[PDB]
């Protein structure tokens, strides 16, 4: 029987004792501000589609920028820790290892390489989640009533460092082991979930199924967020960027200015995507520049357009660089004070 | 004539005033630990040789890991701010912009994309530099006496946020403007510097020439460091990794375990390069794994060999993960306390 690791039952007590013995490493860097580790990753080998690595590079630059502004540490994984949990299941062993190795982290933010930050101002509403252990974008009706395989998203989620979360990982992993287990679990998921195509079990479908069938055990500590785009499906966002620039401003996080643009269905690095690679790549460039404009503007620059790598000044140089203060206070924000 | 920007003459007073008004952003994060921003970058377009982008991705992962452990923020530039200062000269306008935009940073650490951290334990000896404004790997005799074009290295250096440094940037830039200026400067540099081949002016040669011709003006505040490999030439280091693993341990930073392995002359993003690309990529793989083993060790894994992307456990999983303080104290080091 597959196991993520030796059973731990007293992790909340272990963390409590460790935190008391190591006050230099508090789990809350401030009142309503948990210590957060953002975790992402990609394969240790070059992309099968070679230009895909350039897009991975732009993706990590984008996350570096958001995390620098917001005081979040980053871990970038390139190692397969468990051959049975390859592919999109690889995040489970990695997450468990990081939680157990970093008792000082309160929340782990898993974020796919193909999920891009497009609101550099918006800060997660941490106080909203003080009584919750897992936060995912999604809708209660789609998950619990319809059992829709896209009723939630596992490409951008928050998981609290807690015994509950270790237990959740154990309950989530069973459909993952490569081979007959994952193949047959995929048949179950396609039969039981709404709108799922035929393919081996994936972690997102497995989470929908877990929550829909075991709601009494898990649902009370799960927050399905639909107020802002913790995950934002690219197809309904990327063509609207210029309208957002004209009508809105960074900071909204929702349809007015999405926190995350996530390129589900695109395969820039592998093969067999649902959308043409050329369309995906050009929209990924637009999303990158949409986010990057918010970084460059702190420094007096902007992209000439969302489709151009070239930048231009937004203002003249000055011999009093400290008299202004950037429009959105991202050079010296309270998240880093 | 070319100018990096309008003349500022009172930057030290401006920073002093800003720091007093913004005590939430001190320029020293600990008694003798300056606030440091590590700056790197790469050209905005995809590599002409697509696999080059994979190596840029491995490079930034490596820097993320070192900087997470050592409490250093990262800025990754992909924008050309000045068309005249193309190529490696592009770091001058970038550095100036970042210094003037981040008064809270005390040192900017410029590090090339082809420079990799290979000692994850070693911390820079900041107190050694308390009376200096520019720290580069090199030798006084090679720069000031021999005027050798490789007597110092500008691919990994520390520059203090100060008026002196603004003035240094102004004095360093004049040979940079692309075209006739850079071409004619290259003829002067090849004539005046020892061992320099014939090519247009580069920023490293221009720094040797500045210091050798204007030592009274600049030399007092420059620290040419040779006690550890703030820069380390890959061609003499990479073959010795096995010997280092057998005989030494991380933390020395020098010939026993180099802080930086720098792949000067390797150009995996372009078509040429001074050295055969095959050895370049194989040795970049080894340097990445040499550094990555120090990260993975914390988590109970190691690369199967220095040439392999695969990893293996170094120990069994446990239900008491917090009793093991990792060998080199990198999970909870004092740099992040
Ligand atoms: Mn995804
Ligand atoms: Mn270099």
Closest Cβ–Cβ partner in A54, A79, A97 for B47: A54
Which two structure tokens, joined as six digits, stand for B75? 């800025």
Ligand with an atom nearest the CA of residue B87: 2
Ligand 2 centroid–CA B157 distance in Å is 11
Asked how this structure was determined, the answer is X-ray
Resolution of this structure in Å: 1.5
Distance from CA of B53 to the nearest CA of A (A): 5
How far CA A95 is from CA of A89, A90, A101, A258, B57, in Å, comes to: 11, 9, 10, 26, 21
Q: What is the DSSP secondary structure assignment for residue B315, as one 8-state letter?
A: S
Judging contacts by C-beta atoms under 8 Å, the chain B residues touching residue A25 are 332, 336-337
- Which residues have C-beta within 8 Å of that of residue A326, sequence separation ≥ 6? A297, A298
Q: What three-state secondary structure class fits A91? A: helix
Angle formed by the axes of helices B203-213 and B180-192, to 10°?
Answer: 60
If one counts every other C-beta atom within 10 angstroms of the C-beta of residue B70, the result is 20
CB B56 within 8 A of CB B269: yes
CB B286 within 8 A of CB B306: yes
Closest Cβ–Cβ partner in A47, A97, A298 for B299: A97
CB B71 within 8 A of CB B335: yes
Residues in chain B: 337
If one counts every other C-beta atom within 10 angstroms of the C-beta of residue A60, the result is 21
Ligand with an atom nearest the CA of residue B268: 2
Pick left, alpha or beta for residue A71 (phi over 0 → left; psi -120 to 50 → alpha; otherwise beta). left
Pick left, alpha or beta for residue B149 (phi over 0 → left; psi -120 to 50 → alpha; otherwise beta). alpha
- DSSP E strands in A139-242: the ranges are 152-160, 222-225
Angle formed by the axes of helices A52-70 and B51-70, to 10°?
Answer: 20
Distance from CA of A75 to the nearest CA of B (A): 7
CB B281 within 8 A of CB B135: no
CB A147 within 8 A of CB A192: yes
């Amino acid at each position: 029987p597959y196991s993520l690791g030796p059973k731990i039952s007293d992790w909340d007590e272990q963390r409590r004792d460790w935190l008391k013995q190591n006050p230099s490493f508090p789990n809350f860097v401030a009142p309503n501000k948990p210590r957060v580790l953002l975790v992402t990753g990609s394969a240790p080998k070059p992309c099968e589609n070679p230009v895909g690595d350039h897009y991975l590079l732009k993706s990590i630059k984008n996350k570096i920028d958001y995390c620098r502004i917001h005081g979040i540490e980053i871990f970038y994984n390139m190692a397969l820790l468990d051959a049975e949990m390859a592919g999109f299941w690889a995040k489970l062993p990695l997450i468990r290892k990081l939680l157990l190795s970093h008792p000082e982290i309160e929340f782990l933010w898993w974020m796919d390489s193909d999920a891009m930050f497009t609101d550099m101002v918006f800060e997660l509403p941490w106080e909203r989640y003080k009584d919750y252990n897992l936060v995912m974008h999604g809708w209660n009706e789609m998950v619990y009533d319809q059992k829709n395989w896209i009723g939630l998203n596992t490409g951008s989620f928050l998981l609290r460092n807690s015994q509950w979360s270790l237990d959740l990982l154990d309950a989530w992993a069973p459909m993952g082991p490569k081979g007959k287990i994952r193949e047959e679990a995929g048949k179950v998921l396609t039969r039981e979930l709404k709108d799922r195509p035929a393919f081996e079990a994936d972690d997102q479908s497995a989470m929908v199924y877990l929550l829909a069938t075991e709601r009494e055990k898990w649902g009370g500590k799960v927050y399905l967020e639909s107020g802002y785009y913790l995950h934002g499906y690219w197809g309904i966002l990327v063509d609207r960027y210029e309208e957002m620039i004209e009508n809105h401003k960074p900071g909204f996080g929702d349809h007015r200015w999405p926190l995350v643009t996530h390129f589900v269905g695109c395969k820039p690095c592998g093969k067999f995507g649902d959308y043409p690679v050329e369309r995906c790549l050009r929209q990924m460039d637009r999303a990158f520049n949409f986010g990057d404009n918010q970084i460059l503007q702190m420094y007096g620059f902007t992209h000439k357009s969302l489709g151009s790598r070239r930048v231009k000044p937004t203002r003249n140089q000055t011999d009093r660089p400290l008299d202004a203060k950037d429009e959105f206070g991202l050079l010296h924000p309270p998240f880093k004070a």
